[PDB]
Amino acid sequence: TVVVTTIMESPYVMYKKNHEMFEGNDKYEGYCVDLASEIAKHIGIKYKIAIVPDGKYGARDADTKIWNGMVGELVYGKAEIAIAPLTITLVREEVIDFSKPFMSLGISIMIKKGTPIESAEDLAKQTEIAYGTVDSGSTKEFFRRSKIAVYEKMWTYMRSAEPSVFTRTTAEGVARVRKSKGKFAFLLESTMNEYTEQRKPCDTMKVGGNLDSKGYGVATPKGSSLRTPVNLAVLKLSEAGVLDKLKNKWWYDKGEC
Amino acid sequence: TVVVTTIMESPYVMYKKNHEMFEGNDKYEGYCVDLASEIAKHIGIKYKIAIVPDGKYGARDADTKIWNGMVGELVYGKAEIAIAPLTITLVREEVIDFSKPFMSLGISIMIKKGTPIESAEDLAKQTEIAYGTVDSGSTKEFFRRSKIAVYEKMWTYMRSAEPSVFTRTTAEGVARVRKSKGKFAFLLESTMNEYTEQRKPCDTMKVGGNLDSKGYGVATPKGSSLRTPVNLAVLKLSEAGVLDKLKNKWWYDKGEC
Numbered sequence: 058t059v060v061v062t063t064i065m066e067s068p069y070v071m072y073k074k075n076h077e078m079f080e081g082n083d084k085y086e087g088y089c090v091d092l093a094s095e096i097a098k099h100i101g102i103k104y105k106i107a108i109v110p111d112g113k114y115g116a117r118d119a120d121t122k123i124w125n126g127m128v129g130e131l132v133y134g135k136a137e138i139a140i141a142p143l144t145i146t147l148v149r150e151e152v153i154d155f156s157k158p159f160m161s162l163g164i165s166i167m168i169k170k171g172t173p174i175e176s177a178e179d180l181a182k183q184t185e186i187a188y189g190t191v192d193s194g195s196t197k198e199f200f201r202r203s204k205i206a207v208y209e210k211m212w213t214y215m216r217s218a219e220p221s222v223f224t225r226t227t228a229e230g231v232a233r234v235r236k237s238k239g240k241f242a243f244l245l246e247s248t249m250n251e252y253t254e255q256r257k258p259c260d261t262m263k264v265g266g267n268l269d270s271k272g273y274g275v276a277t278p279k280g281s282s283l284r285t286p287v288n289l290a291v292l293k294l295s296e297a298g299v300l301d302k303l304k305n306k307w308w309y310d311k312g313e314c
Numbered sequence: 315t316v317v318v319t320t321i322m323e324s325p326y327v328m329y330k331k332n333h334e335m336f337e338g339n340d341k342y343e344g345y346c347v348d349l350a351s352e353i354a355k356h357i358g359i360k361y362k363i364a365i366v367p368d369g370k371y372g373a374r375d376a377d378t379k380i381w382n383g384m385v386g387e388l389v390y391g392k393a394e395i396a397i398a399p400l401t402i403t404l405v406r407e408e409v410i411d412f413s414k415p416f417m418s419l420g421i422s423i424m425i426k427k428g429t430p431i432e433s434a435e436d437l438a439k440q441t442e443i444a445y446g447t448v449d450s451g452s453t454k455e456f457f458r459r460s461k462i463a464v465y466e467k468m469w470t471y472m473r474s475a476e477p478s479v480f481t482r483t484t485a486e487g488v489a490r491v492r493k494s495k496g497k498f499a500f501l502l503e504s505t506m507n508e509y510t511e512q513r514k515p516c517d518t519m520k521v522g523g524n525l526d527s528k529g530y531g532v533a534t535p536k537g538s539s540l541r542t543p544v545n546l547a548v549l550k551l552s553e554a555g556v557l558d559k560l561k562n563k564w565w566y567d568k569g570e571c
């Protein structure tokens with residue numbers, strides 16, 4: 058049996074109605090739950106879903122040099138494969154292997170319906186509408202690292218802002234948009250943005266184009282025998298239409314708006 | 315010095331005004347010419363551009379089992395790295411290594427302005443407007459392999475059509491759209507589509523959404539020491555904004571419409 062690490066994040070992995078009545082993998086449903094099933098079928102493995110104990114994706118602490126989250130579990134040999142909306146980034150690729158993207162995306166702007174913002178350039182040129190990102194992930198690092206004037210102006214604002222503009226989770230950020238009467242805008246990945254837009258009470262929307270271009274990859278530890286099988290499986294699922302089918306299913310078929 | 319294989323395809327690789335006056339790499343300009351420069355800088359190599367002798371991308375002949383085009387050059391050790399709009403596909407990944415995508419795309423519909431087509435579903439339900447793809451590449455194989463009713467109807471039509479609906483090149487297909495008074499539609503990758511839309515005489519446009527989702531990757535031969543350097547370089551260029559800069563430059567800054 059192969060340990061598959063993942064994280065609670067809608068609609069990728071979620072708890073079924075009364076998971077208690079269910080056992081093991083049957084407790085969870087979602088996009089990555091479906092993805093895991095399909096990949097495991099393709100590569101012919103038995104697998105077990107283990108939610109990353111610390112509820113994190115993967116960063117390396119600057120002082121201690123330890124890797125946390127799902128990346129951590131791979132690096133320290135606690136799991137064999139990570140199947141989650143885990144953004145393909147250089148620092149991560151330096152320590153683990155990513156398959157080709159199973160999903161393509163870019164950073165995007167979530168507003169509450171009615172907010173006079175259509176673009177990053179709209180956000181930067183004002184201070185009346187607060188804006189931020191989820192804390193400690195790839196979006197914040199895009200802004201931290203950016204050398205593009207507009208995003209640099211956005212990073213300086215976000216980093217100095219009191220109260221903090223950074224959220225623990227996507228859901229927190231979404232909650233703050235909905236609850237802030239148009240005074241908070243949220244910078245998150247287009248995939249969660251598009252998802253939320255189709256969720257009651259339908260008071261949110263995506264605005265403007267994406268600030269960048271990247272994808273999510275299935276991750277394994279360096280030297281893993283499961284590397285090539287996993288990668289050829291993503292390409293197979295992609296080409297067979299199965300990835301598109303799964304996005305349509307969890308985003309739009311289950312959509313509420 | 316490293317042999318870099320590539321192919322003539324606008325705006326990726328093209329001949330400069332009077333390349334004769336120029337020498338070696340200085341003869342060519344374009345997106346992949348720029349890409350090669352940047353990657354070579356990042357990984358610290360000397361390199362030489364060699365246009366793939368057979369003017370092909372990479373397929374394996376069913377009888378002889380030989381690989382042609384740019385993939386071929388890698389497999390048979392004629393070049394060390396392929397930098398071109400080479401679509402990441404399973405069969406190719408089985409024989410060579412692809413870096414992460416430097417460009418994201420999907421199959422798209424090119425029409426002559428005025429053509430009453432907005433979608434694949436519009437194309438399939440009629441026969442008055444002919445439609446086809448470039449021959450012997452990943453787009454045709456998407457249609458050949460597809461199990462989705464609409465695309466299967468499209469493949470059966472395309473394969474049976476007389477005269478042939480398949481073109482030697484992108485440019486041929488583009489020429490046939492422009493020249494056919496709205497009686498031919500062209501199925502090509504969104505990247506070339508978007509490019510052509512910005513090219514005089516501006517009589518073409520992209521219509522509807524993409525039929526699929528994939529990317530272009532820098533390719534190296536299996537076991538190459540240049541694998542990880544190349545891959546970390548694409549991620550670096552991506553994250554530094556350089557890929558976006560290069561697309562904007564060759565598509566839109568040089569745009570004519």
Ligand SMILES: C=C(C)[C@H]1CN[C@H](C(=O)O)[C@H]1CC(=O)O
Nearest residue numbers: 114142143144191194195196246
């Ligand atoms: C949900 C979170 C915190 C994750 C998921 N993907 C990104 C990552 O892998 O870092 C993060 C999103 C972001 O940073 O906006």
Ligand SMILES: C=C(C)[C@H]1CN[C@H](C(=O)O)[C@H]1CC(=O)O
Nearest residue numbers: 371399400401448451452453503
């Ligand atoms: C220009 C051509 C013939 C190439 C380029 N990328 C695809 C490939 O790598 O196969 C092909 C496009 C296509 O098939 O529509």
